[PDB]
Design a protein around this ligand. Structure first.
Ligand SMILES: CCCCCCCCCCCCCCCCCCCC(=O)O[C@H](COC(=O)CCCCCCCCCCCCCC)COP(=O)(O)OCCN
Ligand SMILES: CCCCCCCCCCCCCCCCCCCC(=O)O[C@H](COC(=O)CCCCCCCCCCCCCC)COP(=O)(O)OCCN
Ligand SMILES: CCCCCCCCCCCCCCCCCCCC(=O)O[C@H](COC(=O)CCCCCCCCCCCCCC)COP(=O)(O)OCCN
Ligand SMILES: CCCCCCCCCCCCCCCCCCCC(=O)O[C@H](COC(=O)CCCCCCCCCCCCCC)COP(=O)(O)OCCN
Ligand SMILES: CCCCCCCCCCCCCCCCCCCC(=O)O[C@H](COC(=O)CCCCCCCCCCCCCC)COP(=O)(O)OCCN
Ligand SMILES: CCCCCCCCCCCCCCCCCCCC(=O)O[C@H](COC(=O)CCCCCCCCCCCCCC)COP(=O)(O)OCCN
Ligand SMILES: CCCCCCCCCCCCCCCCCCCC(=O)O[C@H](COC(=O)CCCCCCCCCCCCCC)COP(=O)(O)OCCN
Ligand SMILES: CCCCCCCCCCCCCCCCCCCC(=O)O[C@H](COC(=O)CCCCCCCCCCCCCC)COP(=O)(O)OCCN
Ligand SMILES: CCCCCCCCCCCCCCCCCCCC(=O)O[C@H](COC(=O)CCCCCCCCCCCCCC)COP(=O)(O)OCCN
Ligand SMILES: CCCCCCCCCCCC
Ligand SMILES: CCCCCCCCCCCC
Ligand SMILES: CCCCCCCCCCCC
Ligand SMILES: CCCCCCCCCCCC
Ligand SMILES: CCCCCCCCCCCC
Ligand SMILES: CCCCCCCCCCCC
Lengths: 1024, 144, 48, 48, 48
């Protein structure tokens, strides 16, 4: 409606002010994260049964819970793990878009009623149902180096003085704790248990009932007697605080009046709760936190508030504690936002420069300077209206749509300057005629492109949330540009531009002689157009040939500033050997990378193959990007050089790796293939079925590579069977045997107590040196029925036998999660098919099931051409609606293979992959080439019937007058991202993925596709 | 009204009453389903050979295909027209009389000799200086 | 005796049940076929 | 039931009130614990 | 109560901005709403 706004410019300014004021009001109110919610919601039931193994947890806690996880809405699958430390880990994955609070409350209420079925120790330890959110925002570690304290003193200073206050700030969530807080530990000693004639059952029974409450009522209790004057509460016996009070419990008094106490048959030593995880920071002990960003707070000021709250606790530290940050991916977010903002601002500066270079007037070269940023502000307002945030995805959505942003001002201002320069009109009537020439064309552009992107918004899975960000950001920005293009720019071309009619004039002469030479060449090649048609056939066949031979992937790997190093020791290695290997790793990183590596935070018993004691992980954080210049100092070189330098450790699997986004790695190659056991076959026969399925995938190297089992193999275990007749003939109860064995050799968790205000736990267990060999079971005596001490091995035996350190279940049936990846060259559509054709010759009862990242590749994983198949005909119908003809859209939509040649050539030459930035850049390049091909033929169509010209004459007349816009807006764009292409700094993985496609594709779509559309239009108007 | 919010509120008021119910009710497990009132469909599992009785078919349906149908999205409650297996012990009062026993010593012996005992690790944490072994102690398993 | 959850659609629930039964059907013992008695689902589909 | 209004504050009140950070709106949260035995937290969210 | 003490000048400012813009949008001038957005104190002294 531009003629309403030519006569009314102030109303155009008013709606420009409300859209620019509603944009800037919504930039102060929307989140700034790094990536949005990208994974389907998944809740996690986690429980522990102390002292058990994988088998005991796997059929007292695991199978008991997952028989009662029924009737939960929108559930896809469920996978569980039970390992030898006692831990059970159940993950329920839900549909995309399922409300996570409702899902967690339904899972936790179905678990609240399956609670009396569980054992007693699991109910005391507690079962935790919590939602599995993203990974760590930041890790706040803390050390002590000026002096010496243990790990537990640091962890208790954190658990009593930081976690209470760090979680009380603007925008935090789950706060973990790498250490372990206090517990009144009791170290039993079996020789004094022998000589005083006691058992650990007597110890646990003696200190159950020492610290407990008394519901004692009150003096003057109600009902009172007539005349009562006094009222006060009885405060009876309470808990026990100090360790001497825990040492002064009477056990047994003898005939001679002897006093047996806990400090005679034990030692107290207040100490730590869990002794499996030992954190480490550069060679001194440490502790840490686990801060998660919650839902809708920006991570920048969140991390600033965390650093501020740690910054006001240094006056309160015990003379030597120091806070240090071994994992921080917050300044990388700040870099990845600042570079995109700088690219937008320098693109506006470059279009100012190009407009003044081609038009030579200061007064009309700033219509894009006013009219382009208001669309970006309106785009931020629409992004906040949908509820989306400042991701990396929306930022790199507005940085490659800036051509579509900036064309809808260049076209208008060039066309009104052309009308003033040729026919010689005042700016008002010239703007009327100019915006009447391109009236319906811009509405046709808004209909014809809105259909190129919006099928990208309707995929499914975890990659239908990556595409939706681009496919609503670019749609909103373009559909607001087309509104502001016929409202704001006509008013600005009617008011600002000068009515005055008419020596650096070399560029003008060069441009006019290039224009005349162009028109002569195009008029030459509109006769005998067969060679250019067969050249177009060679172009489209070359497009298909280079499109097949190009590796597909996801989001590029880049320098987040940190990387991990994983350590695993073979099959039952202790904690000390893993500490020696971790110290070798620390001594490597702090000597051979003096000028690259800043801090290595070494955690023991933590590794990603599962919990345990023969594993370890190491968070290595480097220096700043400005401090390590070069190509040989980025993470991609340090990782392979450390992995090459970690092959000389004789017995340790140690390797370094980077961080992709969170989880959906394998760049488009992995499997997640569950081998399920849908009968009563068991575990050893399922292991034989897996061992048959492996080494049949090794028979096909051309299709399959790196098929690793993802699961721990069988380790020896120490079976001790209680002989029944010897136990009951000698008169020894089996319950006292089992509560001696499973309380001297594991924790027992008697009860709680109160220390310094807080509430801690009390564990009983034997010493560290009476439970370390198979020859230490003979030091444990148990009372019989009469009172005679009976030893172990008087009623038992001892064998070593193979067990299992980890037991996996999938949808309630036993399974083994075989991982793999496809070979180079072949996709994962003909690799998963070979897995399904290869898992069908297994023995009877063993089935297969896909899970994880491949699960939503089975549920309609071939609906990518099925949506552009209905995008293409909507494009065809809009173009047949515009020109009032059929087969004119055939003349305008044969420019789709023109902008693909340059993008595929640049991706092949530079060495890129078919990631999502390449696809979105290809999908904008073809749309912009279609936009140019629409405008040239809209001039040619409304020049040979409104005037009466011929066919060749009107065609070269139309391509004459539509040459000054096209290279003006390519030169302001295949130049507004040149730096992004040559960028090598922090976060140049996404920047090069954006830059290389939209450089080569744009150059090819403007060099070639100004010579084919006269040929296409003439060939169409010959053969209808 | 909202259905799942209603189930959450009814569950909230029920879990406040769970400690007052007897132990024999809690061990069977109470359940809160948002079912409709009645049967959408029933399935049927005949035997054409004649190798299985009623109890075999009921145990197969209870063990291998009830717990997956009952997790299917859109199913409120699944009734079973059979019974799962259970190690059923039919006692004889004359033989408990002859050997001077009661049905209390039977339940005590089954609780005592059909246990699943957690028994620690023999290379456990915290280790001594110079520990080279780590494995698990396996005391006794549930009977099969 | 499969009942129905509150508010669920009775046609793509029964489709999900018949999809679950075609997944655990090749693992039946020798001679055990599943048969379909009482069902209120196909009447809605035939009437529409 | 076995209360003295300081055991309740330090063992069953400061725990819950310590573990109520992560809820979205909140506004303010007023708790009280008395020597009778009972205790209650009151979390007052934002309007709307 | 103190919340309503902290959002009243923001309310007055945003209402004067939206009325200035809705009059400049409809009378096609920036000088006519400037002769209307200073008759406001003549009413506000009356209310006060
Ligand atoms: C929700 C809105 C639904 C609108 C659907 C289209 C119905 C309105 C179309 C009416 C229309 O054709 O208006 C023309 C404006 O062109 C246009 O530009 C129409 C713009 C369509 C909406 C774009 C925002 C008249 O223009 P005219 O008669 O003055 O032509 C003189 C040229 N010299
Ligand atoms: C979203 C915008 C949809 C507006 C749909 C109006 C489509 C249209 O072309 O109507 C024009 C009215 O101008 C307008 O509607 C301008 C107001 C745009 C508000 C946004 C015709 O404009 P006209 O020149 O035929 O009638 C002027 C008589 N005074
Ligand atoms: C002719 C001139 C008008 C051109 C209109 C072209 C049509 C563009 C929209 C096509 C509608 C298709 C559609 O709704 O799909 C959605 C497109 O995003 C969108 O919804 C984009 C809608 C455009 C909103 C901005 C339009 C300008 C209005 C004025 C803005 C002023 C702001 C400051 C006051 C995304 O699919 P989905 O939404 O279903 O999936 C995400 C759920 N999370
Ligand atoms: C899921 C589909 C949603 C509809 C489709 C989205 C496309 C909208 C196309 C029309 C464009 C309208 C743009 C005007 C809205 C400007 C909003 C700026 C202020 C703002 O961001 O606040 C938001 C208001 O959302 C609002 O609700 C403002 C009204 C938006 C209208 C559509 C809803 C969030 O509220 P808040 O963050 O301020 O609340 C917490 C208090 N601090
Ligand atoms: C191009 C190559 C030179 C770039 C040099 C870096 C300039 C960065 C200045 C921008 C800045 O730091 O503050 C921004 C405000 O801009 C402002 O307040 C600008 C006000 C005018 C100051 C002009 C003097 C700047 C000196 C450098 C000249 C180059 C300017 C290039 C922008 C806010 O940061 P944000 O909004 O971008 O997002 C921040 C998300 N982490
Ligand atoms: C031409 C195509 C026009 C199609 C318009 C479709 C707009 C989508 C409607 C929509 O879902 O937005 C909701 C309401 O927005 C709104 O209600 C604000 C937009 C109002 C403009 C549409 C009515 C104009 C009538 C002419 C979101 O709103 P919500 O998510 O906050 O939930 C509020 C529930 N009560
Ligand atoms: C929800 C449904 C609400 C309606 C959907 C949005 C309707 C937008 C239609 C925009 C067309 C406006 C229009 O016809 O004005 C002409 C556009 O020119 C053109 O000729 C543009 C034609 C290309 C657009 C084709 C759109 C077809 C689909 C229409 C919406 C159907 C959606 C139904 C779900 C002005 O130019 P002019 O009047 O001077 O024409 C002389 C050509 N020389
Ligand atoms: C564009 C069109 C023109 C719009 C210009 C913006 C007008 C904004 C009105 C400001 C009203 C503020 C009244 C107020 O409560 O301020 C208090 C003290 O200031 C005072 O004492 C101010 C006393 C005088 C204002 C009271 C009259 C009620 C509003 C009528 C405004 C009419 C203006 C007509 C030109 C609090 O102080 P603070 O810390 O919030 O700082 C902001 C002070 N301005
Ligand atoms: C910002 C909010 C602005 C709301 C007020 C808009 C009023 C439109 C301006 C207006 O009415 O101009 C009249 C045109 O009316 C007409 O006869 C043409 C129709 C104008 C329709 C305007 C539609 C208003 C809705 C726009 C909302 C968009 C703002 C929010 C994004 C004057 O012309 P005249 O008839 O007196 O003299 C013509 C002699 N040739
Ligand atoms: C950015 C705000 C600009 C204010 C409007 C400029 C003056 C309008 C020109 C109208 C000419 C009649
Ligand atoms: C982001 C800046 C918003 C500015 C909108 C007000 C324009 C005043 C002229
Ligand atoms: C962290 C805030 C990011 C805001 C980016 C604004 C970009 C505006 C570009 C248009 C004005 C030049
Ligand atoms: C973003 C807006 C900056 C202010 C530009 C307003 C220019 C108005 C000129 C009016 C005609 C001379
Ligand atoms: C002599 C070969 C070049 C043919 C003319 C090319 C015209 C297109 C480029 C116009 C800008 C220089
Ligand atoms: C996208 C495929 C649509 C096919 C329609 C072609 C119709 C051409 C008719 C030509 C008659 C002049």
């Amino acid at each position: 409606m531009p003629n309403f706004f030519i006569d009314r410019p102030i109303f155009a300014w008013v709606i420009a002010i409300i859209i620019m004021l509603a944009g800037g009001l919504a930039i102060l109110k929307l989140p700034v994260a790094q990536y949005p919610t990208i994974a389907p919601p998944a809740v996690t039931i986690s429980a522990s049964y102390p002292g058990a193994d994988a088998k005991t947890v796997q059929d007292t806690v695991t199978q008991v819970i997952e028989q009662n996880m029924n009737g939960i809405d929108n559930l896809m699958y469920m996978s569980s793990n039970s390992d030898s430390t006692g831990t059970v880990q159940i993950t329920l994955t839900f549909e995309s878009g399922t409300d996570a609070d409702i899902a967690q409350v339904q899972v936790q209420n179905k678990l609240q009623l399956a609670m009396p079925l569980l054992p007693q120790e699991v109910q005391q330890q507690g079962v935790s149902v919590e939602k599995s959110s993203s990974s760590f925002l930041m890790v706040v570690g803390v050390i002590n180096t000026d002096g010496t304290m243990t790990q537990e003193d640091i962890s208790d200073y954190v658990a009593a003085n930081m976690k209470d206050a760090i979680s009380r700030t603007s925008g935090v969530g789950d706060v973990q704790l790498f250490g372990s807080q206090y517990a009144m530990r009791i170290w039993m000693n079996p020789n004094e248990l022998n000589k005083f004639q006691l058992t650990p059952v007597d110890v646990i029974t003696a200190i159950k009932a020492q610290n407990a409450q008394v519901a004692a009522g009150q003096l003057g209790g109600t009902p009172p007697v007539k005349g009562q004057q006094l009222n006060a509460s009885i405060i009876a016996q309470t808990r026990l605080t100090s360790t001497e009070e825990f040492g002064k419990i009477l056990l047994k008094v003898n005939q001679d009046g002897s006093r047996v106490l806990l400090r005679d048959v034990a030692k107290i030593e207040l100490g730590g709760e869990n002794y499996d995880i030992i954190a480490e920071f550069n060679g001194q002990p440490a502790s840490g936190l686990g801060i998660k960003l919650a839902t809708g707070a920006n991570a920048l000021d969140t991390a600033a508030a965390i650093r501020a709250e740690l910054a006001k606790m240094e006056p309160f530290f015990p003379s030597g504690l120091k806070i240090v940050y071994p994992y921080d991916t917050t300044p990388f977010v700040k870099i990845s936002i600042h570079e995109v903002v700088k690219t937008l601002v320098e693109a506006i500066i470059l279009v100012f420069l190009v407009m003044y270079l081609f038009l030579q007037n200061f007064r009309a070269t700033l219509i894009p300077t006013i009219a382009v940023p208001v669309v970006l502000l309106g785009t931020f307002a629409v992004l906040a209206a949908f509820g989306f945030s400042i991701n990396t995805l929306t930022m790199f959505g507005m940085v490659l749509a800036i051509g579509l942003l900036v064309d809808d001002a260049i076209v208008v201002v060039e066309n009104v300057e052309r009308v003033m320069a040729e026919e010689g009109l005042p700016p008002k009537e010239a703007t009327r005629k100019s915006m009447g020439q391109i009236q319906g064309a811009l509405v046709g552009i808004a209909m014809v492109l809105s259909a190129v992107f919006v099928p990208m918004a309707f995929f499914g899975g975890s990659t239908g949330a990556i595409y939706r960000q681009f496919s609503i950001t670019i749609v909103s920005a373009m559909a607001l540009s087309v509104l502001v293009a016929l409202i704001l720019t006509p008013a600005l071309c009617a008011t600002m531009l000068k009515p005055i009619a008419k020596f650096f004039g070399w560029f003008n002469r060069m441009f006019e002689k290039s224009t005349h030479h162009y028109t002569d060449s195009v008029g030459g090649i509109l006769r005998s157009t067969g060679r250019y048609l067969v050249l177009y056939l060679i172009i489209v066949v070359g497009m298909a040939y280079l499109f097949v031979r190009l590796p597909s992937s996801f989001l590029p790997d880049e320098d987040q500033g940190v990387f991990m190093t994983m350590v695993q020791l073979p099959a039952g290695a202790t904690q000390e050997r893993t500490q020696k290997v971790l110290n070798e790793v620390t001594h490597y990183y702090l000597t051979k990378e003096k000028n690259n590596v800043e801090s290595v935070f070494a955690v023991n018993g933590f590794g990603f193959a599962g919990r345990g004691q023969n594993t370890g992980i190491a968070f290595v954080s480097l220096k700043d990007w400005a401090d390590r210049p070069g190509e040989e100092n980025k993470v991609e070189a340090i990782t392979m050089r450390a992995t090459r330098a970690f092959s000389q450790i004789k017995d340790a699997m140690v390797f370094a790796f980077n961080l992709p986004a969170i989880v959906e790695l394998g760049t488009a190659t992995g499997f997640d293939f569950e081998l399920i056991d849908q009968a009563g076959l068991g575990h050893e026969k399922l292991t034989q079925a897996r061992n048959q399925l492996l080494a049949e995938a090794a028979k096909h190297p051309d299709m399959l590579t790196s098929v690793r089992p993802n699961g721990l193999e069988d380790t020896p275990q120490f079976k001790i069977d209680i002989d029944q007749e010897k136990a009951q003939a000698l008169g020894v109860s089996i319950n006292d045997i089992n509560t001696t064995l499973g309380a001297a050799w594991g924790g027992s968790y008697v009860n709680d107590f109160i220390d310094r205000g807080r509430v801690k736990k009390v564990y009983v267990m034997s010493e560290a040196k009476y439970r370390m060999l198979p020859d230490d079971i003979g030091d444990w005596y148990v009372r019989a029925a009469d009172g005679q001490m009976v030893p172990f091995s008087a009623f038992s035996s001892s064998r070593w036998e193979y067990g299992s350190p980890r037991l996996e279940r999938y949808n309630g049936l036993p399974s083994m999660e075989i991982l793999g990846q496809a070979a180079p060259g072949k996709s994962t559509g003909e690799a998963m098919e070979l897995m399904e054709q290869l898992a069908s010759k297994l023995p009877t009862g063993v089935g297969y099931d896909w899970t994880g990242m491949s699960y939503q590749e089975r549920l309609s994983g071939n609906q990518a051409p099925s949506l552009y198949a209905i995008s293409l005909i909507v494009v065809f119908l809009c173009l047949a609606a515009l020109y009032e003809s059929w087969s004119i859209p055939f003349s305008v939509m044969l420019v789709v293979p023109l902008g693909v040649i340059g993008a595929l050539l640049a991706a092949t030459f530079r060495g890129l992959t078919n990631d999502v930035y390449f696809q979105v850049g290809l999908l904008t390049t073809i749309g912009l080439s279609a936009k140019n091909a629409i405008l040239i033929v809209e001039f040619a169509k409304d020049l040979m019937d409104k005037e009466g010209k011929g066919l060749i004459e009107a065609t070269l007349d139309a391509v004459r007058m539509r040459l000054r816009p096209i290279l003006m807006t390519s030169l302001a764009f295949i130049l507004g991202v040149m730096p992004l292409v040559i960028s090598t700094g922090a976060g140049s993985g996404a920047q090069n993925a954006v830059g290389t496609g939209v450089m080569g594709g744009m150059v090819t779509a403007t060099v070639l596709a100004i010579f084919f559309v006269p040929v296409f239009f003439v060939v169409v108007r010959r053969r209808f």
